[PDB]
Amino acid sequence: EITCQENLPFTCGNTDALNSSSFSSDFIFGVASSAYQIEGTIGRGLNIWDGFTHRYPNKSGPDHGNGDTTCDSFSYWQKDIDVLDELNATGYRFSIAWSRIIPRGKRSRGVNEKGIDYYHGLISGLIKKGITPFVTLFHWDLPQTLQDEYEGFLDPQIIDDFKDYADLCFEEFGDSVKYWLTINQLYSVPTRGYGSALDAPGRCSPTVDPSCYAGNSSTEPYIVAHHQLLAHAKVVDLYRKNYTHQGGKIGPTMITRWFLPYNDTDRHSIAATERMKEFFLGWFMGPLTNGTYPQIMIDTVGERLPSFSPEESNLVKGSYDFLGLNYYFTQYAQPSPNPVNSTNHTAMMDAGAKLTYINASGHYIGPLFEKDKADSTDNIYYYPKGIYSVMDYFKNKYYNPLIYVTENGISTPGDENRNQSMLDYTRIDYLCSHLCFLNKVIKEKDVNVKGYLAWALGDNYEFNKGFTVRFGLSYIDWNNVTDRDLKKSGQWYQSFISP
Amino acid sequence: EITCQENLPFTCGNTDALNSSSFSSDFIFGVASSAYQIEGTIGRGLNIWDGFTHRYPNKSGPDHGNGDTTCDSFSYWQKDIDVLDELNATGYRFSIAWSRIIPRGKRSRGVNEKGIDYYHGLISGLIKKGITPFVTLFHWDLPQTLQDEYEGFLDPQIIDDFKDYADLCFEEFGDSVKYWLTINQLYSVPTRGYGSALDAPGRCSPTVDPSCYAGNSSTEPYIVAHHQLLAHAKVVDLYRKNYTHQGGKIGPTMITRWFLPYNDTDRHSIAATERMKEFFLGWFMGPLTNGTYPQIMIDTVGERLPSFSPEESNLVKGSYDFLGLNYYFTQYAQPSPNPVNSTNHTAMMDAGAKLTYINASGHYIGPLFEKDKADSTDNIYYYPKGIYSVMDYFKNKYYNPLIYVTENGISTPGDENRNQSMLDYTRIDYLCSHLCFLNKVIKEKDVNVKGYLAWALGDNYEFNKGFTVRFGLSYIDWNNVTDRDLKKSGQWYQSFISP
Ligand SMILES: *[C@@H]1O[C@H](CO)[C@@H](O[C@@H]2O[C@H](CO)[C@@H](O[C@@H]3O[C@H](CO[C@H]4OC(CO)[C@@H](O)[C@H](O)[C@@H]4O)[C@@H](O)[C@H](O[C@H]4O[C@H](CO)[C@@H](O)[C@H](O)[C@@H]4O)[C@@H]3O[C@@H]3OC[C@@H](O)[C@H](O)[C@H]3O)[C@H](O)[C@H]2NC(C)=O)[C@H](O[C@@H]2O[C@@H](C)[C@@H](O)[C@@H](O)[C@@H]2O)[C@H]1NC(C)=O
Ligand SMILES: *[C@@H]1O[C@H](CO)[C@@H](O[C@@H]2O[C@H](CO)[C@@H](O[C@@H]3O[C@H](CO[C@H]4OC(CO)[C@@H](O)[C@H](O)[C@@H]4O)[C@@H](O)[C@H](O[C@H]4O[C@H](CO)[C@@H](O)[C@H](O)[C@@H]4O)[C@@H]3O[C@@H]3OC[C@@H](O)[C@H](O)[C@H]3O)[C@H](O)[C@H]2NC(C)=O)[C@H](O[C@@H]2O[C@@H](C)[C@@H](O)[C@@H](O)[C@@H]2O)[C@H]1NC(C)=O
Numbered sequence A, B: 001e002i003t004c005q006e007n008l009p010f011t012c013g014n015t016d017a018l019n020s021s022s023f024s025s026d027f028i029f030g031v032a033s034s035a036y037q038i039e040g041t042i043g044r045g046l047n048i049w050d051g052f053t054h055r056y057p058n059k060s061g062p063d064h065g066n067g068d069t070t071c072d073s074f075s076y077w078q079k080d081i082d083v084l085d086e087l088n089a090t091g092y093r094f095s096i097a098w099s100r101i102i103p104r105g106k107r108s109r110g111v112n113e114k115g116i117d118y119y120h121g122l123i124s125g126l127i128k129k130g131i132t133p134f135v136t137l138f139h140w141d142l143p144q145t146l147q148d149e150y151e152g153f154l155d156p157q158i159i160d161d162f163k164d165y166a167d168l169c170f171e172e173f174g175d176s177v178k179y180w181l182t183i184n185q186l187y188s189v190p191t192r193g194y195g196s197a198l199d200a201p202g203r204c205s206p207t208v209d210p211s212c213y214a215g216n217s218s219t220e221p222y223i224v225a226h227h228q229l230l231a232h233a234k235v236v237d238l239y240r241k242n243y244t245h246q247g248g249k250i251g252p253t254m255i256t257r258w259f260l261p262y263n264d265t266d267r268h269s270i271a272a273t274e275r276m277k278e279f280f281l282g283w284f285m286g287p288l289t290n291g292t293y294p295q296i297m298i299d300t301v302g303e304r305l306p307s308f309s310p311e312e313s314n315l316v317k318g319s320y321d322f323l324g325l326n327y328y329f330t331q332y333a334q335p336s337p338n339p340v341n342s343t344n345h346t347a348m349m350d351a352g353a354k355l356t357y358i359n360a361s362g363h364y365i366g367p368l369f370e371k372d373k374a375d376s377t378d379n380i381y382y383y384p385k386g387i388y389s390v391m392d393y394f395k396n397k398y399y400n401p402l403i404y405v406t407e408n409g410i411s412t413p414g415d416e417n418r419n420q421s422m423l424d425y426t427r428i429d430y431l432c433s434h435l436c437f438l439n440k441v442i443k444e445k446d447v448n449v450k451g452y453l454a455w456a457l458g459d460n461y462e463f464n465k466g467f468t469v470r471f472g473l474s475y476i477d478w479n480n481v482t483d484r485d486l487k488k489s490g491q492w493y494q495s496f497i498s499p
């Protein structure tokens, strides 16, 4: 019988008690990254994260940081491989920058051969060290031209441009890459990019944020989410019909959270909690498993919710071989009004829930996850059991899928000095406590989880935060980015992997 | 009788001998800037100078500097006005960033009202201080979307997109702006952007520079130059047909140089010198004054030189109310081969001339203009009499045009400390020696020159050089860009203007 801790102090950093041998022999362990966050702009065209961070510098991070140079994995990709080799990692998730291989967005406009060569060399280097690539086609970095031509995922033109991009990736890299992710965290671009305008492209209703250049936070999230699902599904169909000879697998990436009632004896909070599962997870998993949106969304969102035609429904339903599930934290849910006629209405209000990290009796859900220095009542707290609850839920609700955990990690402040930054015991505690619960759910519930990729390989540009937080298991000096030095967490993870 | 010095030391910095009263009462004196170089990316879309500097950082400058933040004239435009007011300047040339007012390039995709408001406030502030705006529509900063959709000026689609942009500018600003420049330095984008790939967009033949993403240095300069002339002419026709009520004037900007024979008794060097006038100036001035390219270009360039239809010829011929002439330096010309079959052939080779600053007997043409630390034999030297020779030539060859000198200036090294940078006596010498010759040519040759705008108002991002050189008459601290402090040159110019 497995017992896992939910509260500090944690004792799961002892590799005598928890290590890779605790999991099945074939289980993949590694780390993850994304292209905007690590590569730099050298050698690629411009994308909407360049555009957004440059047009709206205060939204890029408090330091106005951006991905212009970052850790320079364009130059230092071998050093990334070296970190993975030091870890004895068996997996690495990275993304392909669309703007690096098709700078002009649309494939008929030409490809960048040198960009293709960059990923060929990375892939070959990974495989030579026994590391399985998990490759994200689209980690938010849409070529700027496509956003300017037709507003990107707002328009159905995205589907064929994404398909042609993906086809190039399968053609060039699929002989070696056997695990593909389509779109990173399906929920995020619709809500943050087109709802709150916290993320690229930065569209919203005028009274939500007067700096947005255009948008409608009540309608556009739904349009964009719908186009994401269709573009994803078209790419999965292309893969499975035209690239079956490659013997690989493809799936979407979900951001997952668990949800608990703010008041577990209050029917209204219980109802809000179940609505959140539907609106947060079901928005995408309903279509992916059934070809339809959840009934509560149909009912609430009404005419703002697009319909799938019968052909589209069939294309989207079952459009995955596996799911990449990202998991960071869990929230308490309580009821909240949905003011659909307000000029500041957002799609996120349609769930009719307010989310917190403290419940009605004052209990904080778990240890600190992210401190918010402008408003401490907005601090985020984590909940290790949430990974158990999420995986169990996916197995039970969503037809026993094959799952890879494609991100899990925690930040430390960029205000810490290097010695403090390397002494990242809070990261060991977060990672081990989640791995304990992941082992527990695999054993107890028989969830088909086959790998785990921690966020992040190394310090990088963090969306929305610049360089003001660090997520890496290896440390990067922003004054001289060449080295990636394993932190205490990376050293722990090395021992966990090879105990 | 006016006597002007050609060699150090200069004595024209004494405002007792040379000042604004030496010129006609109405003569305009001021300074110049451009949008990429001063504003920053905040509040605008991305253009090809963002793209180029980010994709090819070693081409942006030795420091890899770019226009991301620069002197932040987006925030500090009032401080620019304050410099002009301190100078008692009567003119200011600035450019409108296309990407600030139409971030998506094509006007039907929407305008950025806040971008329009930025230029309204600048213009209103200038006029309130008695400063005449000279506004450049296109100072190289093409929206990236247009380059990615159709390769910008390489394609005739540019004509209508440029026209619609210009129409918006005339509509929004032409009630106050009475002097418009269409395209900055017509020669530069074709040759540097599409020939040598030193400038955005960075296209060339593969063996000219293997880093270019695409191109053909032998053909594309001519295509781009032709489209520039057509786009320019379409905008001038629009202005003069639809905005005549505004009572303003419009013209192109030329980069001018004089040319002297490397050996003034050698017929081959004399011939190369005359070819250079045709290939450098006539490439554009032939079309602008006659609707045709120079015969030597027709003959040499052959099928690589586009033809104007009769309608196009008529549109381009006479398509100016005035000429903005930029002038920095003069070169000696000697013959050089034109290897049209070589894979590294460039359009610039078609003139059949090699350009130097030292003549056959070892004479350097004038004082140092720009030191080249990697190769000192490549240092640039200036020639004050060249402004006299250029203006005389334009009057005689090109039908006595109305001229404004729209740039004239010199750099100092970014390695100098602030005190050295403020003690910019070399800039006083350059500016005064040219102003002496400009007064001389107006008086002796009756050239219709009505104003002079020195480059630059303040230190800025210099194309190709980052922040490694300074051109300003006012100093900017890159660690804190708010202030613009008049240098010795700015203080001299203040006294010259109001002696
Ligand atoms: C998994 O996918 C299944 C579909 O493959 C989902 O089942 C479908 O659920 C639909 C409701 O979401 C059912 O549609 C309703 O059908 C009634 C019945 O219509 C038939 O007979 C009538 C009925 O009197 C005729 O008019 C109609 O032409 C048919 O002959 C409809 O009125 C109802 O329409 C109203 O409600 C819609 C909102 O739900 C409004 O959008 C619409 O304007 C109406 O106001 C709805 O019809 C659907 O209307 C929208 C049209 O675009 C669509 O084509 C039309 O079908 C549907 O019958 C059922 N299909 C079958 C094969 O069972 C399934 O839903 C889950 O299970 C069903 C049983 C129900 O409990 C759902 O609430 C629940 O979500 C999906 N499963 C999951 C887990 O999501
Ligand atoms: C100012 O613009 C003026 C035009 O408005 C320029 O004058 C034009 O100069 C053209 C040469 O550049 C002259 O064209 C040539 O015409 C002969 C004569 O053709 C007529 O009679 C013939 C002749 O036997 C017929 O075949 C023809 O159909 C006419 O009936 C042409 O052969 C000659 O074509 C050859 O040379 C071209 C290169 O110059 C090649 O491109 C072509 O393939 C041939 O190999 C040329 O014809 C032009 O050919 C190209 C066609 O696209 C074009 O439509 C055709 O006209 C032209 O006659 C003259 N027009 C007039 C009204 O004078 C003027 O040029 C300057 O002055 C002229 C007198 C001459 O000294 C030029 O060298 C000099 O540049 C321009 N001024 C300036 C300062 O540039």
Ligand SMILES: *[C@@H]1O[C@H](CO)[C@@H](O[C@@H]2O[C@H](CO)[C@@H](O[C@@H]3O[C@H](CO)[C@@H](O)[C@H](O)[C@@H]3O[C@@H]3OC[C@@H](O)[C@H](O)[C@H]3O)[C@H](O)[C@H]2NC(C)=O)[C@H](O[C@@H]2O[C@@H](C)[C@@H](O)[C@@H](O)[C@@H]2O)[C@H]1NC(C)=O
Pocket (backbone or CB within 6 Å): A263, A264, A265, A266, A267, A360, A361
């Ligand atoms: C978890 O949710 C539960 C269920 O909602 C909370 O318990 C409920 O708390 C209500 C007060 O917020 C209780 O109602 C009140 O009852 C007193 C005594 O009769 C009365 O004077 C009040 O006016 C009020 O009555 C309601 O007034 C509004 C009417 O529309 C409605 O019909 C009346 O119910 C309610 O009885 C209670 N329900 C149960 C089943 O206990 C619970 O609140 C926490 O516990 C209750 C017992 C009370 O001590 C609250 O102070 C305490 O906050 C909530 N838990 C937390 C931690 O918030």
Ligand SMILES: *[C@@H]1O[C@H](CO)[C@@H](O[C@@H]2O[C@H](CO)[C@@H](O[C@@H]3O[C@H](CO)[C@@H](O)[C@H](O)[C@@H]3O[C@@H]3OC[C@@H](O)[C@H](O)[C@H]3O)[C@H](O)[C@H]2NC(C)=O)[C@H](O[C@@H]2O[C@@H](C)[C@@H](O)[C@@H](O)[C@@H]2O)[C@H]1NC(C)=O
Pocket (backbone or CB within 6 Å): B263, B264, B265, B266, B267, B360, B361
């Ligand atoms: C400015 O250009 C002028 C005109 O080209 C240069 O003068 C010419 O210089 C040529 C040498 O580069 C002289 O030709 C030579 O004459 C000597 C004496 O006969 C002879 O032994 C040489 O072989 C050579 O002759 C030529 O050989 C090639 C044949 O194809 C051709 O037919 C022959 O001409 C030439 O006479 C001379 N022309 C004139 C009109 O003086 C001038 O060069 C400078 O001055 C000349 C006089 C001489 O001292 C050169 O050393 C000196 O460089 C050049 N000025 C400069 C500063 O480069």
Ligand SMILES: *[C@@H]1O[C@H](CO)[C@@H](O[C@@H]2O[C@H](CO)[C@@H](O)[C@H](O)[C@H]2NC(C)=O)[C@H](O)[C@H]1NC(C)=O
Pocket (backbone or CB within 6 Å): A205, A206, A215, A216, A217, A218, A219, A303, A304, A343
């Ligand atoms: C968001 O788009 C919606 C749908 O176009 C706008 O909502 C509608 O408002 C139009 C004018 O009031 C109403 O007549 C419709 O009844 C509404 N339709 C629905 C589906 O709600 C909404 O106003 C736009 N929001 C913004 C801020 O522009």
Ligand SMILES: *[C@@H]1O[C@H](CO)[C@@H](O[C@@H]2O[C@H](CO)[C@@H](O)[C@H](O)[C@H]2NC(C)=O)[C@H](O)[C@H]1NC(C)=O
Pocket (backbone or CB within 6 Å): B205, B206, B215, B216, B217, B218, B219, B303, B304, B343
């Ligand atoms: C530049 O474009 C030109 C014109 O397309 C190319 O020149 C031609 O080369 C084609 C193949 O040799 C020849 O058959 C033609 O005779 C040439 N045409 C002319 C007008 O010169 C040239 O090869 C291209 N250069 C590059 C480096 O691609």
Ligand SMILES: *[C@@H]1O[C@H](CO)[C@@H](O)[C@H](O)[C@H]1NC(C)=O
Pocket (backbone or CB within 6 Å): A015, A016, A017, A018, A019, A020, A021, A022, A499
């Ligand atoms: C690995 O952890 C298991 C418990 O899951 C333990 O029995 C085993 O001895 C540990 N391995 C090492 C090498 O410490």
Ligand SMILES: *[C@@H]1O[C@H](CO)[C@@H](O)[C@H](O)[C@H]1NC(C)=O
Pocket (backbone or CB within 6 Å): A055, A056, A057, A058, A210, A211
């Ligand atoms: C940040 O930038 C936007 C312009 O993009 C501006 O609207 C907003 O006032 C600024 N935010 C703060 C908090 O200053």
Ligand SMILES: *[C@@H]1O[C@H](CO)[C@@H](O)[C@H](O)[C@H]1NC(C)=O
Pocket (backbone or CB within 6 Å): A237, A238, A239, A241, A242
């Ligand atoms: C598959 O490839 C063939 C050849 O390009 C093409 O005809 C077919 O439309 C493609 N398929 C998809 C997505 O099925």
Ligand SMILES: *[C@@H]1O[C@H](CO)[C@@H](O)[C@H](O)[C@H]1NC(C)=O
Pocket (backbone or CB within 6 Å): A342, A344
């Ligand atoms: C608009 O929304 C903000 C946050 O969503 C809220 O605090 C404010 O009360 C709302 N105002 C109206 C008019 O509803």
Ligand SMILES: *[C@@H]1O[C@H](CO)[C@@H](O)[C@H](O)[C@H]1NC(C)=O
Pocket (backbone or CB within 6 Å): A480, A482, A483
């Ligand atoms: C930067 O870091 C690399 C790796 O440690 C080192 O070899 C190089 O010398 C350093 N550069 C400077 C300028 O210190």
Ligand SMILES: *[C@@H]1O[C@H](CO)[C@@H](O)[C@H](O)[C@H]1NC(C)=O
Pocket (backbone or CB within 6 Å): A088, A498
């Ligand atoms: C790498 O992991 C394999 C598989 O568990 C193990 O056999 C090998 O010893 C490990 N290597 C190192 C250096 O840890």
Ligand SMILES: *[C@@H]1O[C@H](CO)[C@@H](O)[C@H](O)[C@H]1NC(C)=O
Pocket (backbone or CB within 6 Å): B015, B016, B017, B018, B019, B020, B021, B022, B499
């Ligand atoms: C201006 O320069 C002229 C010579 O061009 C001179 O005569 C005049 O006195 C100078 N003005 C002043 C105020 O020094």
Ligand SMILES: *[C@@H]1O[C@H](CO)[C@@H](O)[C@H](O)[C@H]1NC(C)=O
Pocket (backbone or CB within 6 Å): B055, B056, B057, B058, B210, B211
């Ligand atoms: C500079 O950058 C380009 C890549 O854009 C590369 O081809 C070239 O080698 C580099 N130049 C030098 C001198 O290192």
Ligand SMILES: *[C@@H]1O[C@H](CO)[C@@H](O)[C@H](O)[C@H]1NC(C)=O
Pocket (backbone or CB within 6 Å): B237, B238, B239, B241, B242
């Ligand atoms: C002028 O404006 C009118 C109204 O848009 C338009 O019909 C005409 O085509 C425009 N003109 C040019 C460039 O002449």
Ligand SMILES: *[C@@H]1O[C@H](CO)[C@@H](O)[C@H](O)[C@H]1NC(C)=O
Pocket (backbone or CB within 6 Å): B342, B344
């Ligand atoms: C190619 O051009 C470079 C500079 O233009 C020149 O130095 C070199 O000799 C040329 N090579 C050939 C093959 O002509």
Ligand SMILES: *[C@@H]1O[C@H](CO)[C@@H](O)[C@H](O)[C@H]1NC(C)=O
Pocket (backbone or CB within 6 Å): B480, B482, B483
């Ligand atoms: C920056 O420069 C401005 C103008 O001199 C000054 O007022 C401001 O205090 C300076 N900022 C810092 C941080 O020194």
Ligand SMILES: *[C@@H]1O[C@H](CO)[C@@H](O)[C@H](O)[C@H]1NC(C)=O
Pocket (backbone or CB within 6 Å): B088, B498
């Ligand atoms: C501004 O120039 C005008 C015109 O020459 C002159 O009358 C006025 O005195 C000057 N003002 C200053 C402060 O120099």
